């Protein structure tokens, strides 16, 4: 693949991910759709970046969301694009933490 | 819901010229809008929009209306809204109707672009199902 | 088969049949029969006319007319043909549209 | 109705001088009449006017009558009638009888013919059914 | 078989048999048995006769007669001879026309 | 029912110079009323009167009786025609009682002369009962 | 075996079988038994005599005794031996006939 | 009954100067008698009277007695009379003893003459039954 | 084997043994032992002596004496030993006769 | 109870600069406790401190706080003290965690080195349970 | 009154029958012209019951 | 009542597909047109009702 | 009352048996006659009775 | 008296996330501030009670 | 009263069997037919027994 | 009863200056008892005394006492005794014992001279029971 | 296995040992463990020591212990050690005798 | 009245246990011993027991 999505129950946990995740740094676009209520994060990686690299941040994110319980061919139907291309500094702009 | 594909399907034959609006043009309609889980789908199975305008070309006054067998393509659809989607019948459900409905133009142009109608069916659940099995 | 045979369930579909729709322009005659106060569709094309021209105008006629229930042999002997060779445009010439 | 099939039976009989109206008369009725489905049944299998008419020659006065059994034919035949369908008799249902009552001059010409009996009864009874099954 | 039997149930079948058959030309003698009120009918054939005329004989037989339900063997035991040789031919004679 | 299988075997005796009538007597009663079903199934396994007196001659008081057991076969017989035939003996009942009451002279005029006891018995079924089941 | 026994249920019947019996003239010893009042006939053939003639002259005998239902040895022990090699003789000048 | 044999066993010990009568005395008892069923049964093993003195005496005051073992076998004898007969006891039954209580000198010489006991059985069974079942 | 053993259900057989039989003359010693008021008689043979001498020597005891029902070792162990080597002398001296 | 495991995740935590203690944190705690059950089953798999670093550094301000599925592998650890013991929970739990919860960082850590979680399921319950079953 | 006929049909049948078993068919013959002759007026008598409902 | 005229539409109805099956296609079609008339003519009194309902 | 011949055939019969199974033929002869003599007796007896019947 | 919260929760929830779904993030983020707030007013409130109780 | 010895008979049997058990030969012998002398004076009373039944 | 193998258990290990009644010095004590059943049970496997002298002294103060497991196996062959010879017990009961009490120094001795406990319990079952089956 | 481990139900059974046990002459190592109030004796050999003569100690060690019933990396967790590499002798010194 | 030991010696025995699990051998010794004097004297009161019935 070059695509994985994962699930964020609340915004709070989406502003977790923003503040303390340290990503592995790799070249990738990501995308946080919207369906009743819930979040949903997905991350498209550039063709040169191999499928282990993709895995593992795979595996960085499931500490903080759970499997996607819905298709990436779902959600680019129904779900509203929130915000696009850099995510998690959006979030970090426009939401403090305590 | 995306009732724009209707909207294609009309404005299609009327660009035509058809006297008659018909699975053919509901079909067409779908790949109008790529958007949508039936575009992705049928694109999956390698059918896409400029083979379908080839086929519908060699397979076939005034206002327009639908084809006896298209109206009951779209209430058969609001059938298959069965999977509890209520009132929101979209493409997958569209293409789900053509499905289950396996007459007429459509199922003619499904026929010459091999489709296999059964894998369709699964690919479209699969589609709408939680991936996690 | 050189014959196809459809079922309309009232004159108003082949009154539709015959305003609203245009086929694959083709060498063929035609026969409308009655029975049981239900109209049967039947045509018949050239030799030269392959099997898939003939599938392609029979899913054309599916699009208002349903598959028949009765057979051809059966519909010879007990049906009345009502018009012959010009079935379309004799009904656009005796029947206004809507 | 078919009563012509008897109509022309009996003429047949009277040019041929025979003493009697047997089913070979009968069958000789249903060619006859190459409008019916006994007479298309029969032509699908290659059965046909002339070959009958020699087998009957080569197998064999006041006013004729039935021989009895061709009397049991028609009463026969009737009650092949008698199924769900049952408003009246046709030429189908003749066949049926002689199909059903398997003796006689009729039967024989089958046999020496080679027609199957049970793919001719399985034959007619497809020719009614509705083919959508 | 040389020889072929069938059965009337009443005098009258046989009286229409002699009257309305015509036989198939043939080299054949012929006997009449009665046992229980019944009517049975035999034809013994020439050795020259095929197996094929005999069964031609025999079709045209079964259009007046029933099948015979008692062997041979048995009525040319139990059985009365009634007439021999000329069966048809001396019924006509004994019999006015029906 | 033809008595005259009996009322002949004082004579065959009486010609015999023998002093007993017994179930070879009986036998020979059988061959001599050619009419009877018992003579026409066994001349269809070849036993001819002239073999049979071959064989009794070749294993054989002025008054003559019956032995022992041809009294039993003769009411032996009798209890046959519970087959349904009343009191009517015939020759066949008689041939199915030496059948049945496989000892004696008679049984070894058979086992002699080669006859299979269980097809004799079939072959006399068959002609009692009706040809067409 | 060169011994065949044979039962006679009554004196009336050995002395039916003394006076109306025409044996086949062979060589031959015979003996009569008797238990429980019932009497045993029994014949001992030479050995020269082929074992067919011995069969038909058992067979014979079937006409009249029935066959024998013990053994030859248990009769040999138990039985009382009643007369010896000319049972018919004696029998017929003892009784006089029917 | 078969008390003969008895009165052969004392003679036979006597003659042989044995202290004891046992079931070799009772063995040698039954060869006295060839009316007997037992010397029939095993003269018909080919167990003749010269074979078991040899045996006897390979295998070996006055006031002689039955052996413990002798008195069972006795007894037992009279228990296969429960094959209901009278207690009339024959050579038959005192052998049914000795095949059933197979211990002893009597076992043995059976044992040494390779008699098959349950065969032996089944030969004095066969000879008692009606022969014709 | 080299021994022989059966069992004597009171002295009085064992007294009828001892003048009543006449063994095969053989080279072999003899025990008797007692437990639970019952009595067991032993045999043990010269090595010499074959397994058939010794079968026929030990089917004659049986005219008298049972199958033992306790092993040679059980006895061994467990039985009294009344006398050896001259059982039969022994008690012949010791007992009158019945 | 090793508690002492939770004070090598942060520390380690904290000494990679890491801004969340997460399934790895728990990992390198459990192989910074020899003593435990954990560490010697790890061991017996040739699972080991230094190959789980690299394998950590490969896979990868201020106070910290556990991720959201670290807190579920703890509390999973103990609804597995309380299925087994009640009694405290100790470094086979949390290790038994990670076994269940089979996500995130740990998991990759056992994929990359290979070791079967159910064998390493089974090698903790079979040091747990009696060596004698 | 109709049913007063059907046993003279009997008898002259089963006179018929016995004749023509007696090979007396001349008799025979007459027998069955009499049973054609009763049998057409005994039609007669149930056409006049027909008529009468 | 409103219900005065679904007879009359069967009525006319049966007419036309006689008229039709006697191949009367002139006198069929003015039927249907008659057909059709009493249809929207009962279609405006089931919306007059659908209102006064 | 005719029942009263049976008991002495059987006695005469149970005395033939045992004369012949003493090999007293001449006894079991004559006794075989005076049966054979009693047999007649009684079935003129069961004559006299069947006509009285 | 803590029930009288509860529902003010819900209400600054279902706002917050109407306005993340509207792409408001600025109201967003002061109804997410608002929420914690009143969240640490409800605790004030339940662990007081915890403690009266 | 016969039944008064048989306990007699049963005392000497155990003490016979002791006695053997002993290897007390002489003893066992001299028990033995006194055993025997009660033996016959038990069957002689069952015999006077016997007779007087 | 052979209580004096309990004697000789300990004299053998007052001889050999061992402070302990063992499970070996039970075993050396049933092979000073050669009357035993169980000396000839063991001897019938070759467990000649020598070797297992022999075995012992590779194998391995004051007054002294029996192991623990002495002391289990003693109580353990006086529950073999529901074999019901609880009238007393005796050597075969102690050697059934140690071969159900399968651990200790005799165990080994056992395992050591290749001694079968299913076949050494088979062969002192068949000593004890009735050789009539 | 180089290392064996036993159980011991109670004080009084390893101060048995201690006195009583005459072990094998072999170079190894001892430990005491105690959990619920029940101790385990655990014993390390030397490298050159063979197998077999370890199951030989460890059998001896079974007069007197139980068979362990929890596993060494247990006991090495949850265990308090009581005593190393003298065990016996440091209970003989420290407890009086049975 | 016997029983007032059992509390003694189990309280003396738990003690031990104790005392060696905290490594204190020689007092755990010192329990060993008042455990095996309370033993004693539980013997001679279960003798007295004994006795008395």
């Known amino acids: ?48 970046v191999d499928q282990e690299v993709i895995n593992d941040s795979y595996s960085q994110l499931l500490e903080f969301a759970y499997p996607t319980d819905r298709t990436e061919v779902y959600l680019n139907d129904y779900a509203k694009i929130i915000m696009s291309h850099n995510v998690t500094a959006q979030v970090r702009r426009y939401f403090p933490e305590t | 819901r995306a009732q724009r594909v209707l909207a294609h399907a009309q404005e299609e034959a009327i660009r035509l010229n058809h006297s008659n609006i018909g699975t053919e043009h509901l079909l067409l309609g779908l790949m109008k809008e790529p958007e949508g889980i039936a575009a992705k789908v049928l694109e999956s199975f390698n059918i896409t929009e400029d083979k379908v305008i080839e086929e ?3 397979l076939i006054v005034g206002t327009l209306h639908y084809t006896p067998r298209a109206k009951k393509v779209i209430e058969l659809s609001m059938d298959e809204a069965r999977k509890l989607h209520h009132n929101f019948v979209g493409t997958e459900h569209i293409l789900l109707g053509l499905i289950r409905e396996n007459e007429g133009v459509a199922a003619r142009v499904f026929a010459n672009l091999d489709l296999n109608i059964t894998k369709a069916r699964a690919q479209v659940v699969k589609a709408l199902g939680n991936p996690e099995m």
Do not use: C, Q
């Open chain 2, 56 to 58: 519908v070309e060699k």
């Open chain 1, 1 to 48: 693949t070059r695509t994985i999505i994962v699930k964020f129950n609340d915004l709070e946990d989406v502003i977790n991910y923003a503040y303390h995740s340290n990503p592995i740094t790799t070249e990738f676009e990501d995308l946080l759709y919207m369906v009743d209520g819930t979040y949903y994060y997905a991350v498209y990686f550039d063709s040169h």
